[PDB]
Every structure is written in C-alpha cells, then in structure tokens.
Design an enzyme around this catalytic site. Sequence first.
Site, PDB file in Angstrom:
ATOM      1  N   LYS A  38       0.989  -1.330  -0.068  1.00 15.29           N
ATOM      2  CA  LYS A  38       0.041   0.053   0.011  1.00 15.29           C
ATOM      3  C   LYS A  38       1.029   1.150   0.238  1.00 15.29           C
ATOM      4  O   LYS A  38       1.714   1.462   0.840  1.00 15.29           O
ATOM      5  CB  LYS A  38      -0.974   0.135   1.310  1.00 15.29           C
ATOM      6  CG  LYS A  38      -1.964   1.241   1.025  1.00 15.29           C
ATOM      7  CD  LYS A  38      -2.975   1.209   2.425  1.00 15.29           C
ATOM      8  CE  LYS A  38      -1.957   1.592   3.701  1.00 15.29           C
ATOM      9  NZ  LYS A  38      -1.583   3.059   3.834  1.00 15.29           N
ATOM     10  N   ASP A  82      -3.262   4.422  -1.380  1.00 13.35           N
ATOM     11  CA  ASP A  82      -3.884   4.875  -0.265  1.00 13.35           C
ATOM     12  C   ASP A  82      -4.072   6.287  -0.401  1.00 13.35           C
ATOM     13  O   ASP A  82      -3.463   7.160   0.392  1.00 13.35           O
ATOM     14  CB  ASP A  82      -3.437   4.422   0.884  1.00 13.35           C
ATOM     15  CG  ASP A  82      -4.221   4.662   2.222  1.00 13.35           C
ATOM     16  OD1 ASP A  82      -5.436   5.115   2.021  1.00 13.35           O
ATOM     17  OD2 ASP A  82      -3.717   4.272   3.334  1.00 13.35           O
ATOM     18  N   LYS A 103      -7.159   8.105   0.075  1.00 12.93           N
ATOM     19  CA  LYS A 103      -8.087   8.571   0.635  1.00 12.93           C
ATOM     20  C   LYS A 103      -9.029   9.634   0.072  1.00 12.93           C
ATOM     21  O   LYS A 103      -9.209  10.705   0.592  1.00 12.93           O
ATOM     22  CB  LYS A 103      -7.779   9.128   2.178  1.00 12.93           C
ATOM     23  CG  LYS A 103      -6.894   8.469   3.063  1.00 12.93           C
ATOM     24  CD  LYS A 103      -7.657   7.213   3.948  1.00 12.93           C
ATOM     25  CE  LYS A 103      -6.672   6.611   4.928  1.00 12.93           C
ATOM     26  NZ  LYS A 103      -5.343   6.214   4.443  1.00 12.93           N
ATOM     27  N   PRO A 121      -6.070  -1.512   9.065  1.00 12.84           N
ATOM     28  CA  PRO A 121      -5.034  -1.103   9.754  1.00 12.84           C
ATOM     29  C   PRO A 121      -4.911  -0.513  11.122  1.00 12.84           C
ATOM     30  O   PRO A 121      -5.947  -0.387  11.796  1.00 12.84           O
ATOM     31  CB  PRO A 121      -4.446  -0.009   8.701  1.00 12.84           C
ATOM     32  CG  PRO A 121      -5.644   0.820   8.776  1.00 12.84           C
ATOM     33  CD  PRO A 121      -6.775  -0.375   8.465  1.00 12.84           C
ATOM     34  N   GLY A 161      -3.303  -3.912  16.737  1.00  9.57           N
ATOM     35  CA  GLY A 161      -4.336  -4.919  17.234  1.00  9.57           C
ATOM     36  C   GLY A 161      -3.766  -5.992  17.005  1.00  9.57           C
ATOM     37  O   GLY A 161      -2.608  -6.402  16.391  1.00  9.57           O
ATOM     38  N   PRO A 190      -2.978  -9.475  15.468  1.00  7.44           N
ATOM     39  CA  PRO A 190      -3.165 -10.300  14.238  1.00  7.44           C
ATOM     40  C   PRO A 190      -4.324 -11.250  14.220  1.00  7.44           C
ATOM     41  O   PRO A 190      -5.147 -11.384  13.608  1.00  7.44           O
ATOM     42  CB  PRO A 190      -1.892 -10.760  13.954  1.00  7.44           C
ATOM     43  CG  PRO A 190      -0.848  -9.563  14.470  1.00  7.44           C
ATOM     44  CD  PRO A 190      -1.554  -9.696  15.755  1.00  7.44           C
TER      45      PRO A 190
HETATM   46  O1  UP6 Z   1      -8.015   3.863   9.537  1.00  7.86           O
HETATM   47  C1  UP6 Z   1      -6.962   4.064   8.879  1.00  7.86           C
HETATM   48  C2  UP6 Z   1      -6.799   4.272   7.619  1.00  7.86           C
HETATM   49  N1  UP6 Z   1      -5.383   3.993   6.997  1.00  7.86           N
HETATM   50  N2  UP6 Z   1      -4.411   3.976   7.822  1.00  7.86           N
HETATM   51  C3  UP6 Z   1      -2.991   3.881   6.963  1.00  7.86           C
HETATM   52  O2  UP6 Z   1      -2.534   2.644   7.191  1.00  7.86           O
HETATM   53  C4  UP6 Z   1      -1.147   2.681   7.362  1.00  7.86           C
HETATM   54  C5  UP6 Z   1      -0.884   2.303   8.644  1.00  7.86           C
HETATM   55  O3  UP6 Z   1       0.736   2.480   9.142  1.00  7.86           O
HETATM   56  P1  UP6 Z   1       1.360   2.182  10.568  1.00  7.86           P
HETATM   57  O4  UP6 Z   1       1.235   0.746  10.915  1.00  7.86           O
HETATM   58  O5  UP6 Z   1       2.776   2.703  10.625  1.00  7.86           O
HETATM   59  O6  UP6 Z   1       0.518   3.164  11.522  1.00  7.86           O
HETATM   60  C6  UP6 Z   1      -0.788   4.434   7.195  1.00  7.86           C
HETATM   61  O7  UP6 Z   1      -0.241   4.389   5.683  1.00  7.86           O
HETATM   62  C7  UP6 Z   1      -2.036   4.977   7.594  1.00  7.86           C
HETATM   63  O8  UP6 Z   1      -1.968   6.227   6.816  1.00  7.86           O
HETATM   64  C8  UP6 Z   1      -4.256   3.911   9.289  1.00  7.86           C
HETATM   65  O9  UP6 Z   1      -3.291   3.710   9.788  1.00  7.86           O
HETATM   66  N3  UP6 Z   1      -5.858   3.882   9.451  1.00  7.86           N
END
Ligand code: UP6
Lengths: 206, 216
Positions: free
Chosen positions: B40, B68, B70, B178, B181, B183
Amino acid sequence: MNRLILAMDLMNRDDALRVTGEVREYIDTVKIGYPLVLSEGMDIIAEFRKRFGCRIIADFKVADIPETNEKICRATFKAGADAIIVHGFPGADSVRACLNVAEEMGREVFLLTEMSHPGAEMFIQGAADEIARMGVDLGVKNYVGPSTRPERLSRLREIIGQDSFLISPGVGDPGETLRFADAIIVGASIYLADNPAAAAAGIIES
Amino acid sequence: SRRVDVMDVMNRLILAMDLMNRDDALRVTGEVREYIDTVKIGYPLVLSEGMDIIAEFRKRFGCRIIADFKVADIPETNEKICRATFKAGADAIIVHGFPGADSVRACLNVAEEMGREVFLLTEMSHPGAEMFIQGAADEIARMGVDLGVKNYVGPSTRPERLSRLREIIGQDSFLISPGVGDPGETLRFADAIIVGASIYLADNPAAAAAGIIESI
Ligand SMILES: O=c1cnn([C@@H]2O[C@H](COP(=O)(O)O)[C@@H](O)[C@H]2O)c(=O)[nH]1
Ligand SMILES: O=c1cnn([C@@H]2O[C@H](COP(=O)(O)O)[C@@H](O)[C@H]2O)c(=O)[nH]1
C-alpha cells in the site's frame, strides 16, 4: 484580488499554464489540487508560484490519521505551497497534526467544514457545525464552506466569527456568497471557457 | 486456499510503505518481498518521489499495489484523481465514504472504465475517528453495499467494530484493516491486515515481518 480564487484542475501543464497566465490580472491566488499535481508532479507548485507571483493553496483534502497527515503537510510545504486544505471529519487529532506542521514551517491550514456537492448532505452536513467549532477550539483561522448552500454558509460564518477567513466553492450567486465568504473559488467556468479572462471578468462584474 | 472466490494477499499481510525517500522505500520493500506480495503506497511517498514510483514498484518487485489516497472530493474531482492513479498503474484505490454516495460512484465509474478496483474506507483506526466517523460508519458501509462495493477498509484497533462491519458487508466482500491490534483476532474478521512502521522502521524489516506472520 477581486476576492476570486482560481481552481486550476486542468491535467496537463500547457493548458494549465496558459489559462492561469490569461486570468492573472483578475485573481492573485491559485488553488492547485491532485488532478494537476498527480498528472504533472509536485514541482508544478513552485513553478506556478514563480511564473505568476501568486499564493498557492494546495487543495489536498487531507483526511488520514495524524502521523500520515504530518508527512503529507511536510511534503506539501516543502514543495512551496502557502496553505493546505484539510478535512475536519477525521477529528481533532488529525487536524492538530496539520496545524503543528504549518506552525513549524510558517504556513497555513484551511479547515474544510461542509462540502458543496449533493452527496455532502448524507454525512458531512450533519457534522459541519461541530467541525467548525472544533476548528475554533483548535485555533483555526482559515475555513472552506459551500457556495451551493448559503443557508449553511451563514451558519458556518456565525460559528467561526468575523475575524476568520472563509472561502467557498461550488455553483452559487457571487453576490450572496461574498456576503458570508471572503472569497469564492471558481474552476471549470473559467478554465474550460473559450475566453478565460472574459469569463473571469464576466464574473467580477457582479 | 482459504477462500476460493478471491485469492488472499500473501500471508494476509499488507505493507504500508510510508517512507518518504525512494532509496529507503525500495530497499525495505525488496527486503520483505519474500513474505509480502501486496504494498500500500500513499501520499507520503508519492508526493515526495512522484507518481512514477508506482510503476517502479510493480516492475522491480512484481507486487500488487493499492494507492491509499483517501479520495475525498466532489464527484468530478474524484474522477480525475482515480483516472490519474489507475493510469500510473495502481491495482486499487482507497476512497473515503464520508463525502457521500455520488463521490463514491464517481470512483467506481472510473474503476469500471479502466478495469481496476475501489476500496471503501468506512471507519478509521485513530482516536479522532470516534468524533464523527464512527457514528456514521455503519451507514457508510450499508451505502457501500447498496452501490455494489466489494472491497472495504476497517480498524484493526477496534476488533468489535471490525466484526460489526464484516456483518454488514457479508462474507463475500474483501476487508483489510490497519492500526495496532492482535493479528490473530483481527484476522477473524479481516481478510488482511495492514502494517507500516513496525516493519519499515525496524532494524531488520524481514525479521519484523516474519515475526508478525508467526504471531498470527
Ligand atoms: O483508519 C486508517 C486508515 N488508514 N491507515 C493507514 O495505514 C497505514 C498504517 O501504518 P502504521 O502501521 O505505520 O501506523 C498508514 O499508511 C496509514 O495512513 C491507518 O493507519 N488507519
Ligand atoms: O466542497 C467543496 C470543496 N472543494 N471543491 C473544489 O473546488 C473546486 C471547484 O471547481 P469547479 O468550480 O470547477 O466545480 C474543485 O477543485 C473542487 O474539487 C468543491 O467543489 N467543493
């Protein structure tokens, strides 16, 4: 200038540079978004700024988690953007992350309260007043509202106060909109017109 | 194969590549390619290195790419963003469901015209998501179902909410999530979990990934 902001959403440099150069004497701020940046690269921002001597608002509708929002704002201000548009729907911490970077780099954040399109009524409209007050609580001084719903615009303006700066986009009446907003954003009406300067001129004469 | 209607991403683990320089990003991704085949990529990397980085990942690593972005604008703008993103070579794009059904249909229309996929983000993982998004999440998900959306993004931070979302979208939909949490529990509802910094900031990326998969 003239309280008019051009939304340059053309997707090729040639057309974008031509239309912008053609309406320069009418507006002094250009809103650049993802349609142009994803097609031509982030360097387009510094080029527009240099060639037209205008301020640039990066309309990126930032809507991620705080940590990612920080990264997006940093890359955007590094590219030369004067301000960035951030969604309020994701909450206070996502917005505060943008404000922190803007403070560190000497730039500004615009908080998008309610959107102007039809779909906006589904979920955003029901949260708009609260999003606007959240901005006030965070100390946000710049806002974006909907030109299509002056009833909503006036409520929004009441919430943020008169010291704030508010801009709105969408189809409306320049006269009544510039009654709540400090400036209106106009895009396709200008950049797709046979004569952009005329269309722009045509617009201010109101 | 766990599912026969849709093949799982390798090890049901998606790397969120949010490093901001091309060299570091390509290095860490190549180092975990043995465990992950789906990456992603978001704005942190794309706005730092250009949209061409998407085709470069595909060429070099043969991975699947989810942009990603959004997507959260009006219909007309959403269409232009999706068109540019699919032209850059993304296999799928993540769009917000909160701006309304028309903004979402705009994305689906382009996805249809270009033979690609749309993922609908319903509830976000961070604390601020509780303020407005969580209250509308169930509705956003049902709206997705009504529009024909088959791919969704949910919160790993809230297993109870993920379960509830899975309930709404059905077992035939594809769901990824994401945030921090467990797995094991997350994967009772999601088809795949997204992991970013815990892997890409590790001293040994391949080890962090191997570890996470063993955790599951
Ligand atoms: O609700 C959401 C939606 N998207 N992401 C995205 O997923 C990735 C999570 O990364 P991290 O494991 O380093 O915190 C990042 O690109 C972040 O913008 C979240 O964390 N939460
Ligand atoms: O609620 C909002 C927020 N932003 N914009 C943006 O402002 C510009 C308006 O352009 P238009 O006059 O051509 O429709 C576009 O870049 C669009 O994404 C809206 O239209 N409505």
